[PDB]
Curated annotation (Swiss-Prot), chain D:
It catalyses: L-cysteine + L-glutamate + ATP = gamma-L-glutamyl-L-cysteine + ADP + phosphate + H(+). Keywords: ATP-binding, Glutathione biosynthesis, Ligase, Nucleotide-binding. HAMAP family: Glu_cys_ligase. It comes from Escherichia coli (strain K12). It comes from the Bacteria. Belongs to the glutamate--cysteine ligase type 1 family. Type 1 subfamily. SUPFAM superfamilies: Glutamine synthetase/guanido kinase. This is Glutamate--cysteine ligase. One of its GO terms (cellular component) is cytosol. One of its GO terms (biological process) is hyperosmotic response. One of its GO terms (molecular function) is ATP binding. The lineage of its organism: Bacteria, Pseudomonadati, Pseudomonadota, Gammaproteobacteria, Enterobacterales.
């Protein structure tokens, strides 16, 4: 089932320095909770300053949904330590509150939306969330995940580009990465899916107790999870075609969202009633990215510069790491992304893209089932999952050797040897491990225990990159940038909204 | 420019009885106004009963906009007499109100004050009003007060028989779609002859070179029908929306698709606002009647059936011509000369070969319409084929068509007896050598002398005094009294039969 | 979800004359009714002679249920004109009676004493009537008044020669594809979204004030559990001729716990032919049936000659045709049957067959629901129905080009353009159009209104293929054959050798 | 609205090789500005040598208005790389100055004293600066600081030889007529001046931003509007016949102007214009597209046309592409190939002076409100009827057939891919250059937007290595161009007035 990538792997092995200088970033979301596991109804801890402007710590959907973001970085350990400083400082600055360490929340059935002050941008961001709330439900929006941001170094593109060609070849390369990701990225929830159970608050042969599926990996990625939009016809063959379909989705009115109404009794209910209010609403396992200029839209930035990096969005929170993600995951992603850059990925119509999802749903719902077979697209399932994983890992192993030869060491090769074991025994995967524990003490019980351990752990750990003066300097600089904005507001909200 | 139809005309001259039994109906709208020309703000007159259910008399968009509908009829004079009886009874049962005799109303200061047609509290009645609420929010109430006449026309079965099974209704449909394609190509002769709205109040408003008076009357020196221009209406055209007239299923699918397509323009309006519903939905067409159409294929519906359902089921039954302005020179807004001209022209449209046309070929036929609409009376105006450079002097094009219409008139006259259709040809062909004979030249002189306002007020008074004194000829007073009672009763029965509140009922109909 | 069929389509475009000479037949059933909609209790109209032996007109289950059958034909227009002649002649030879124009009846009470079809005193006749007595006693007579159209179809020899056990295997392939994808038929042409209460479940039925039940997005309740349906317990499969015939012969001798409780007799009156799951082979309910013209039981004919043609049985009555079917349906079935012969169909166990039913039931019960998704077999629903239909029609359109090139014109391509619009807009389907009419006037009002207008239309049309002499000649010939049969052992004794 | 070109296209599909050997050239103008966005007041950068004589790099109206010009070329990639070398070299040889990336300048006051392009002391150099003085006094300097891109285009002789010089001329006049009719598709897709500095100011429904920027919500190219680089229609110039064209043009040059006679010829001995006729010289006639033949020594544009006929056409309608560091990209060049071939194929009836003026009605709609939902277009001056999207899709049906023919002789599917990309702009005007740059200007202003683009493009182009021309080619051309100017300056030339009378 895995394509023949031998040609490209030989190329890579002749060009080991093509891979030097991979850039990465991480985003991790966590709900602030009280000791009994209920959702904290207090505001964004004052020590964090302005969620709207803060360089490293913000909120996602809810006022109580923290999100930490690491500055782009060439060093895995540096990035992971940075993320941990963010967690350490926050753990010691939120009273008795602790951070929920699971993807799926459990003590939620009326949740406060993220608050960003009174500026226009800050009211538009909250309004968007009101929109999502009304369209999808507040509950689904408290599900947590980790995003992994990744770019190959220029050396990679050079080793295969001058002037206008460069931005085009890099975009073609990332769209290829994206097509291969749709085809083979179910390997991620297989290994690291960590939500085989959901609370009642959220058709499928569920076992009841808390609801679970015996072989499930990542329900966060199922229909009951963070999802929504298959009618949009978005494809990943070509930069212009991609943006055209996405820009088109932005201008597509939805009847169902028109039925919600743009406003009801003085309270504005959503930005508009198109399929996507803004481009961020397009749910995706993986996303093409390019840092936007001030106020610039995601697709404008892409049209102007091409794809800059990619955002992998499929990771559940790692319940076994106090920061929700670990080095073993990051390194596997490097390997798998590089592999996705190397393998031939024919173009895919949107019905072919829907066919790639068949393997994902098998993995999401019953990935650990003994005897599970997978197919090529919609074709008859005939490839036993363990052999597919092992074929993939043969390739990843060659990538690991190259990465290790330039960095020094065997860190990547070790990762491969650890994770390929999960195909021989699914009981090694995050979801087998976490289900055992949720069946033992429930989602609530399990999450509270981890939350408590991780809080006591992170509260005692000295900072390593950031000093307490860096957080205080940024609390000041961030809260200031927000006032700088709130004053500078020419027109009033209702008018700025129109334009 | 006029195609060669000698082969079909020779066919017709050999089968004169193929035309025996043309069926017709008329609808005519008029605003109820006070002596001053302003819209009456009283309810639908009591003597007229329920606008919702009445057989002959209803309301269109506004509560002050009357509409009169004759039952399908094979006799022109009988149908026009019936129409006049409706006007006569109404004229004497509307208090001090009278009927506005022009397509174009005089100055209106606040379109948003115009009361929409009220149909009582039944769910069906509230849906009809909500439809109008939607039209108002989408296009504004003002343009909806512009009025016209619809001419409904069907050829007899004997026409098609002189030209089996499942094929019969398909051949009839293809014949009517042929009529429609020819109407698009050549229908501009209608506003040329009978357009009667060369002026518009500024309160209803371009780079058009309008002449202006101090009361706000805007006019174009050679215009025929501003009602049919982009200033005279508000909706998207079938033409503009992508709908074609080559094949029935194709036509029905485009229409049904427009009903199902959401609109960002209309979502911006919102569906509700302060607990007041503003539209039925936010799709391109709330319902099928919302489609702007100068000519419409029809089949009478059965209960539950949408207009396009009935077309799909039984094919095209008849066509509705919608391009006629109100005739300001008739108390009933329409006369025999017009009806007879349309008989000749529709029959000609059924005889002339009409190649299929794509959306853009259809859009091209409108080039000549726009020339006629805005300056049809300009000395030296030339027309062209579709979008090609204009090279055909209008007078000669009209003379050529009338040569054919004259042969159709000879046939219709030989079967009906007399010379009535032939006289109409001779009367009307003269308008091509003298545009000062057309309706629009006549009504422009009038409006220069006394404005839209003074012209309508003076005709409205004169016509009121004719109509309120003339004896009923077909319907008698007791027929109006009975239809009033029966219509009120049908409305009471619909109100009592509802079982679901409107909000709930609406969800299964929106 | 629609398999890739490009090799077979390329093969076909290279061999266009492979499709020249498709053969077809139509069967249409219709209840004889009075102007008030009630079931006529007169006998089989006299002008039609013997229902038992007549060549073109007969009865189905009920003496009042007419059935029209066209002789196998290679021309579509000819076949539909012939069927129409039969309707014409019948319309003007049944007093004030007319033909009910819908699949579902309205003015029939449950347990109503419906006269079973009567075939005279011959052993054969008494056996046909006894079969129906069995059906009546097993399933009730109400269900048996639901009517339908069957479409009979065979590819020419030219088809197989361009590619006898090859022909059987080809038709079994057709059958397997039909089970997988044939829900496309009730979607487009289902015309029974409402049911009278007589036929009454956990289905979310709506009910009108006048007492009619319906499902808002239903296509064909004739094909639902409440309709003309089941028996899957028999484990018949469609992989091999002998396997099929064996399962069927076995079914006829499998005893029924349930039907034994009915008994073979009460009070000197025989109640059923036997107490097995199937009294005869024709009792096996099926959306589609392998056929060979018999001399001989249906399975004997298949063993002797192999599959000669297939009978599509899923068509509801077309309420918009005076004859219950139109050219659009006929051409679509050509296209789709040819497509079924071209797409690869793996073999299927009886549980893989049971799984094909999931999409059928979805389409039957809510096929018009916005956002309906289908799945492969029993797996997660993930393919939006419009996208699947358009996927299929890309292939059908290529088959249509081929049929049009060898036939002249564009009639098949026109039908694709028309029917593909129903995937964009389900309100264009038969069931949407007929539901608007039924919600307003009822099954009863809608059927009466249509029946009245078709009666007037058909009475006025002249015959075109058949002459009155032919109906007269056939009445006489058929009555002769019946009495010649009655002349040619008493019944209870003959039955001991055939039950 | 789009004419039927079925027959011409069927002809082309059976003669694909009639198109092989298309020649092209680009000109792109850009203001030198400081990092704060103000107009540089330094002279033409030294490393560039003599603007008067340089082969590739020159000035337009102002001393700070750089202009880059590619030598005629058959290969698109090669022409764009050449253009890019010119920008690379220049960006690293102008101190801390950078290139303004937009058509409309900001931070330039109306009645700002803008230095005219300086060409030295020769007759030719003095003549060129004088013509610019004429322009400044006739139309004002400010408008002349608007920049654009010109696309120069010729079909191979191979194309005329499949369907002598008189027939090539007639063929380019047909291209010009169709270009007047349908060329508004260019500002629609690629216009990029929807906003305008206050400096340039009407009955137009302008929005003002708090920042203070004027814009029309649906505009595409205000550069092409009456407030931009525009107007002269009453000269009665027509494009039906070569000799009729030059006759009209030659007549306009001799037509006195009483408005310009009021400026005077001299004031305090200083000449203020070349003459007071409606056109000082042929190049003063504004036009969206121009017939060209390369001129010999002492030949006017029209002299060259009378001698050898039309050689190629110049499309003048392109705004600067704000999203390309060189102000133009391959997608635009390929579209114009397709479009210019289509203009050569489609029949174009002859048009009178006033029919040509009537073609401006559609241009002005597109210019002022081309991205307006539901915009309709008309034929000539007649009522708008045709939805803009439907018109673009019909055009692109034919362009796709041209594209297929060009791709088949070039290999690949690059032309077809462009058709697909741009037809999408008819379904969504938010894809167009003007929708995109307006978003950016509403958030950050013209100045803010231009500065950020100019800064990014400076850092980008200063790091890219030269590909076709090396530093040494620029040094050699610098020195050669300086030498050519010195030689013209040292020549024993005629008295200036006598020399004027004998020009053109
Ligand atoms: N036969 C041809 N076909 C296509 N392009 C040509 C041809 N001959 C010259 N060119 C191009 O035309 C352009 C000439 O530009 P330039 O020397 O600036 O003259 P110009 O356009 O007459 N001056 P301006 O007044 O600024 O328009 C170059 O880009 C040449 O590549
Ligand atoms: Mg992220
Ligand atoms: Mg009407
Ligand atoms: Mg006169
Ligand atoms: Mg049958
Ligand atoms: Mg130039």
């Amino acid at each position: 089932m895995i394509p023949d990538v031998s040609q490209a792997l030989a190329w890579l092995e002749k060009h080991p320095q093509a891979l030097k200088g991979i850039q990465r970033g991480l985003e991790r979301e966590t709900l602030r909770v009280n000791a009994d596991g209920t959702l904290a109804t207090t505001g964004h801890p004052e020590a964090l300053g302005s969620a709207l402007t803060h360089k490293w710590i913000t909120t996602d959907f809810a006022e109580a949904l923290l999100e930490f973001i690491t500055p782009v970085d060439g060093d895995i350990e540096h990035m992971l330590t940075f993320m941990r400083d963010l967690h350490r400082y926050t753990a010691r600055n939120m009273g008795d509150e602790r951070m929920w360490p699971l993807s799926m929340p459990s003590y939620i059935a009326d949740i406060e939306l993220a608050q960003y002050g009174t500026s226009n941008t800050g009211r538009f961001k909250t309004l968007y969330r009101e929109g999502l709330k009304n369209r999808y439900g507040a509950l689904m929006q408290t599900i947590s995940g980790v995003h992994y941001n990744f770019s190959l170094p220029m050396a990679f593109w050079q080793a295969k580009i001058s002037g206008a060609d460069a931005k085009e070849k890099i975009s073609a390369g990332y769209f290829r990465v994206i097509r291969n990701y749709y085809r083979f990225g179910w390997v991620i929830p297989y290994l690291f899916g960590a939500s085989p159970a959901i609370s009642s608050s959220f058709s499928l042969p569920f076992e009841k107790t808390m609801y679970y599926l015996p072989y499930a990996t990542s329900l966060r990625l199922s229909d009951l999870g963070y999802t929504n939009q298959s009618n949009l016809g978005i494809t990943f063959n070509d930069l212009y075609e991609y943006v055209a379909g996405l820009k088109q989705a932005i201008k597509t009115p939805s009847e169902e969202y028109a039925k919600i109404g743009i406003e009801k009794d003085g309270k504005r209910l959503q930005i508009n009633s198109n399929v996507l209010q803004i481009e961020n609403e397009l749910y995706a396992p993986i996303r093409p990215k390019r840092v936007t200029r001030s106020g610039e839209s995601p697709s404008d930035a892409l049209l102007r510069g091409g794809i800059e990096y990619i955002e992998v969005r499929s990771l559940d929170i790692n319940p076994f790491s106090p920061i929700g993600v670990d080095e073993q995951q990051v390194r596997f992603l490097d390997l798998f992304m590089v592999w996705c850059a190397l393998a031939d990925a024919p173009e895919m119509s949107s019905s072919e893209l829907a066919c790639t999802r068949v393997n994902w749903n098998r993995v999401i719902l019953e990935g650990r089932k003994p005897g599970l077979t997978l197919g090529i697209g919609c074709e008859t399932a005939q490839f036993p999952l363990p052999q597919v994983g092992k074929d993939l890992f043969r390739d990843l192993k060659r990538v690991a050797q190259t990465l290790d030869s330039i960095n020094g060491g065997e860190a990547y090769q070790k990762v491969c040897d650890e994770l390929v074991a999960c195909f021989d025994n699914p009981d090694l995967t995050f979801s087998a491990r976490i289900l055992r524990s949720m069946i033992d003490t429930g989602i609530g019980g399990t999450g509270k225990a981890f939350a408590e351990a991780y809080r006591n752990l992170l509260r005692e750990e000295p900072l390593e990159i950031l000093r307490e003066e860096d957080f205080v300097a940024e609390r000041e600089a961030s809260e200031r940038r927000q006032q700088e904005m709130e004053a500078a507001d020419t027109e009033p909200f209702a008018v700025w909204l129109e334009k």
